[PDB]
């Protein structure tokens, strides 16, 4: 005898409309007036069908950290950063830039980098693993548990 869509939310017994990605909320929808939204600021954003009344601050890609802009900040997405031709993002979040490489899942760090030696990676043996790419983490070992339901590869842990 009633419904509620996926781009709507429930408030005050009425099913109101969420603001589209990029628009913030100004006031809530009533019986006879719908939700009023407003676009974000030139320097702001919002990822989602939302009901927030403030937008998010845009990511700055700082050159003093070696950061370039990979994709511009738009109303509906955040600024994406990356690094110069020979550099690496420290993590996926790419907060700054490094020259040292990181071992990928399946490998662990034998030797953290120093001076002009790059990080030294070895493959994880039986039974050790690495589920992340990292410049610091070595292979940690699998749980030696009771009910072995799934075996472990190397880059995943024994799930029991």
């Amino acid at each position, epitope marked *: 005898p009633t419904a509620c869509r996926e781009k709507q939310y429930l408030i005050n017994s009425q099913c109101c409309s969420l603001c589209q*990605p*990029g628009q913030k909320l100004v006031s809530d929808c009533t019986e006879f007036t719908e939700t009023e939204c407003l676009p974000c*600021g*030139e*320097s*702001e954003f919002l*990822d989602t069908w939302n009901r927030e009344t403030h937008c998010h*601050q*845009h990511k*700055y*890609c700082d*050159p003093n950290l070696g950061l*370039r*802009v*990979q*994709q*511009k900040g*738009t*109303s*509906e*997405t955040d600024t994406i950063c990356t690094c110069e031709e020979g550099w690496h993002c420290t993590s996926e979040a790419c907060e700054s830039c490094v020259l040292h490489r990181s071992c990928s899942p399946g490998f662990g760090v034998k030797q953290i980098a120093t001076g002009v030696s790059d990080t030294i990676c070895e493959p994880c043996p039986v039974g050790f693993f690495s589920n992340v790419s990292s410049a610091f983490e070595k292979c940690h070992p699998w749980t030696s548990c009771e009910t072995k339901d799934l075996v472990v590869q190397q880059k995943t842990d024994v799930v029991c």
Partner: antibody
Amino acid sequence: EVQLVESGGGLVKPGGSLRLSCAASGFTFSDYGMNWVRQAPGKGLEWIAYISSGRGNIYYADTVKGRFTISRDNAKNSLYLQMNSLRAEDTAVYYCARSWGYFDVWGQGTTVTVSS
Amino acid sequence: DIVMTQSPDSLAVSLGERATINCKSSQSLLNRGNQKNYLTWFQQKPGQPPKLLIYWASTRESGVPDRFSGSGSGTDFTLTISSLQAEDVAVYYCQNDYTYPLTFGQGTKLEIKR
């Protein structure tokens, strides 16, 4: 009205210094990002500097990195370009341009000639 | 640094016919978040600042005659001016509006054949 009025251009000797102004009117200058685009004589358009609407984020083209510094004065409704250590390739018309994702209002254009 | 290569460099088109200006980017201008291609078109007339024509590759700016139609996506874009008019003589630029540094195409000088 929606206007952008450059001023400050002219002749200057190499290594010298210049400060272009941009006088915004007819809209809320605070709400917009601001840019400088130049055009070498008989050549194309080159984006050189950007300043954002909020925290005041700043990006440059590599070709003016170090020498040129973009700034704003929301209180005085104005965009500014400090050009320093000027080379002969800096000779161009300097275009003021507002942005809210895309350039949509441009300035008059003011000519900068770097010559001995 | 993204590179826009327009095509042709020069174009001579008869009055009232259709003008086709192509633009190719070294990278994709596609924002996966909002499904928009960040390609802007400009028309610069003699000794005049460029006037904005089309943004998000196909959205005609308010005020611009509907003869001006942007299109394309991925790396290949095109500006079409139908039923060409004399006042359409100018240089046309495509711009990367996807990331910094914002890079323009090298221009396309359109001449009106009378």
